[PDB]
């Protein structure tokens, strides 16, 4: 046991030295050679109303017009951004829903929560009524996040510190990702769907592969539980947000943080993070009844999106980057542009 | 300007909004309470008796008493980090806390169970989300405590205790010990009650506590309190 612990410590020191050897220059010194972005003004366009409970998850569709949002009332609503009309209303058996996902093709949707079971609902049913298609059970913890890898397979994250890839047609988990010491909180799929990063309460993130089913890499630097994680539009980097009131951008090739986003007046944790289409700007939802935009290259605050009446819970940018939706516990989802 | 399909979609959205409003008004019609306590604290017996009077994850029990519906949420099986999802129960009406009154000399793999129960009660009471959420303490092992105190002294658990070995003084001291843990007496109160073989008395006490709270909530909502 002692020899194994000494070997682990030696490997950790070697990894630290290797990560430090690559820190030839910081992102700030390189980005100081470009002019800063001007003041970004985003005015709320649509004010979606109809929810009577706290919002906890939302996801846009490939069409960049429909967005599915989940609330604690047990009702999943698919809103139309352009007309603010409800397309469907899925009544959940367990009102304690915390995560929701919208498949790429939009034929199926996934949801989960404290029930420890992921429910899949089909929207293109010939019967005409949205009915649960498959119930993926087996998780010993609450479902924190889930995203559609493909129309056939899906990946889910549970509070039991282990994720699982479930096949819809089969219904049994094929790959089990283990290694996290804390409860996994959020997921984010890469553009190629081959690798995915997951953050947990252990103040560290892990990049895993789909087919291999092993931890491809690990990233550290956070001081609290990582609440949100998002992939960079290019697929070579990813941002993470924890309760330490600061975001951290990591690169899958450098194996270390590039730049930190923080401000003295910000003392509360972060709930959601999402990049833009071009990645030039980053958005982060905070608990002070608003969201903040940061410069991904200079970390300068680009703007503040205020108007939410409660803790900001989720935010998402359209696939085309036209507008950005933000949902909070106040039961209202606002679109900004 | 809206075309035929647009007007039809708007009408369907209005119908969905009406259905959602009706569902919300119907659900606002049921009280919500959160059950907490150790597995051996008698929660199972309380749930069984309350169901008679009327797998991993969280359990949801529904029962009506005096034309009043209740939703008991049991999260005991959710052995995970509570501070990351307990906030979901911010709007809960009451917190039914069950503690093992007789399990004061046993050992658990704090070493003692009473200290752990007190710590959990203090953490749930002083929680930032339960500043106003009322708590109702239930002692589901009063008979075992009466049968054990005659042989095993209470000093083993509370060395500082020096009162008489009678059951009344010991019960009063144990009650005051949990009552003093409330650091928010100005905004919230605790309703303590001793459970026994009888079950209707506990249901009546829960109904009265829920009735008191609904009253205080309505008073604070209309602007009076």
């Amino acid at each position, epitope marked *: 046991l002692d020899q194994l612990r000494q070997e682990a410590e030696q490997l950790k020191n070697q990894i630290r030295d290797a990560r430090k050897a690559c820190a030839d220059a910081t992102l700030s010194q390189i980005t100081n050679n470009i002019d800063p972005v001007g003041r970004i003004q985003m005015r709320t366009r649509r004010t979606l109303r109809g929810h009577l409970a706290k919002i906890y998850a939302m996801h846009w569709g490939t069409d960049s017009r429909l967005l599915v949002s989940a609330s604690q009332d047990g009702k999943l609503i698919i809103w139309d951004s352009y007309t603010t009309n409800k397309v469907h209303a899925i009544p959940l058996r367990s009102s304690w829903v915390m995560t929701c996902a919208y498949a790429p093709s939009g034929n199926y949707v996934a949801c989960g929560g404290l029930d420890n079971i992921c429910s899949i609902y089909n929207l293109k049913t010939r019967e005409g*009524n949205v009915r649960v298609s498959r119930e993926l059970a087996g998780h010993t913890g609450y479902l924190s996040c889930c995203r559609f890898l493909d129309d056939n397979q899906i990946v889910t994250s549970s509070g039991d510190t282990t994720c699982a890839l479930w096949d819809i047609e089969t219904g049994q988990q094929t790959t089990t990702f283990t290694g996290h010491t804390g409860d996994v909180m959020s997921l984010s799929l890469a553009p190629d769907t081959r690798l995915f990063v997951s953050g947990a309460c252990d103040a560290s993130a892990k990049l895993w592969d789909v087919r291999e089913g092993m931890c491809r890499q690990t990233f550290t630097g956070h001081e609290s539980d990582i609440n949100a994680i998002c992939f960079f539009p290019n697929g070579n980097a990813f941002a993470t947000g924890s309760d330490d009131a600061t975001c951290r951008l990591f690169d899958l090739r450098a194996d270390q943080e590039l730049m930190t986003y923080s401000h003295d007046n910000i003392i509360c944790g972060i709930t959601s993070v999402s990049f833009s289409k071009s990645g030039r700007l980053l958005l982060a939802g905070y608990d002070d009844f608003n969201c903040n935009v940061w410069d991904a290259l200079k970390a300068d605050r680009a703007g503040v999106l205020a108007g939410h009446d409660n803790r900001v819970s989720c935010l998402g940018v359209t696939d085309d980057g036209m507008a950005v939706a933000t949902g909070s516990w106040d039961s209202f989802l606002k679109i900004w542009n | 300007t809206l075309s*035929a399909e647009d007007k039809a979609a708007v*009408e*369907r959205s209005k119908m969905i909004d009406r259905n959602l409003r009706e569902d919300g008004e119907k659900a606002a019609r049921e009280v919500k309470l959160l059950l907490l306590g150790a597995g051996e604290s008698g929660k199972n017996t309380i749930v069984k008796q309350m169901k008679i009077i009327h797998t991993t994850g969280i359990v949801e029990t529904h029962f009506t008493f005096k034309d009043l519906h209740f939703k008991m949420f049991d999260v005991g099986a959710q052995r995970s980090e509570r501070k990351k999802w307990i906030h979901c129960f911010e709007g809960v009406t009451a917190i039914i806390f069950c503690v093992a009154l007789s399990d004061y000399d046993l050992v658990l793999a704090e070493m003692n169970r009473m200290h752990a129960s007190m710590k959990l009660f203090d953490s749930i009471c002083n929680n930032k989300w339960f500043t106003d959420t009322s708590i109702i303490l239930f002692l589901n092992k009063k008979d075992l405590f009466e049968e054990k105190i005659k042989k095993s002294p209470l000093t083993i658990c509370y060395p500082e205790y020096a009162g008489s070995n009678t059951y009344e003084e010991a019960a009063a001291y144990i009650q005051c010990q949990f009552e003093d843990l409330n650091k928010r007496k100005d905004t919230k109160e605790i309703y303590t009650h001793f459970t026994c073989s009888t079950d209707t008395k506990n249901v009546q006490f829960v109904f009265d506590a829920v009735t008191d709270v609904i009253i205080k909530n309505n008073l604070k909502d209309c602007g009076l309190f």
Partner: single-chain antibody
Amino acid sequence: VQLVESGGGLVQPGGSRKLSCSASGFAFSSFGMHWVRQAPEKGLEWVAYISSGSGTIYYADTVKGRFTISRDDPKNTLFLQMTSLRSEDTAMYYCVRSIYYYGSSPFDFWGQGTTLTVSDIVMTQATSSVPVTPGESVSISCRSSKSLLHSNGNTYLYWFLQRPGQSPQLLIYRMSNLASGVPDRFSGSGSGTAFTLTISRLEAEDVGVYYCMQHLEYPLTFGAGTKLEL
């Protein structure tokens, strides 16, 4: 999904008939119902329509005020009271489903209909009969009096295929979306008022009549219909 109509037969002009369509196999409440007649050797024609929850009911000028369309969601039954009958009202009345939401394919299912005998944007198809052998591609052209392209950015056009002894089948909706279950051989395009339905390779199953429908204004007009037979 199945629709069975009842009521009809021989009816004198001064008589009245209550046609009843029993709906089953789908959410009847959420799906509105349209009535479309088809006289002998004549094209289709919209009769009346009921919206979800009976919130909006519409009738055609040819039947406005004379007929009464009602609905029963608890019982899941569509009712049509026909008070007065004219010498030209004899036609097979078909009940059609229609749900309205972003991405919906209304008029997808057509009922079998019932036979009853009694003792506006203009749509026109260039060709009526186009004899062609199987295997060769086919093209059916259509023209609308008014531009169906709405400011929202879509064209309200529908194509239906009615085979001998079978009810119409939705081929393409909104001029660019292929109906579910229809072979990919069918394609639709158009511009402003000139539309075209193309078939890569005709087959025996394609023998039948192709009808067009505009849905920009609720008064629906159907074309004569282009017939294709080997």
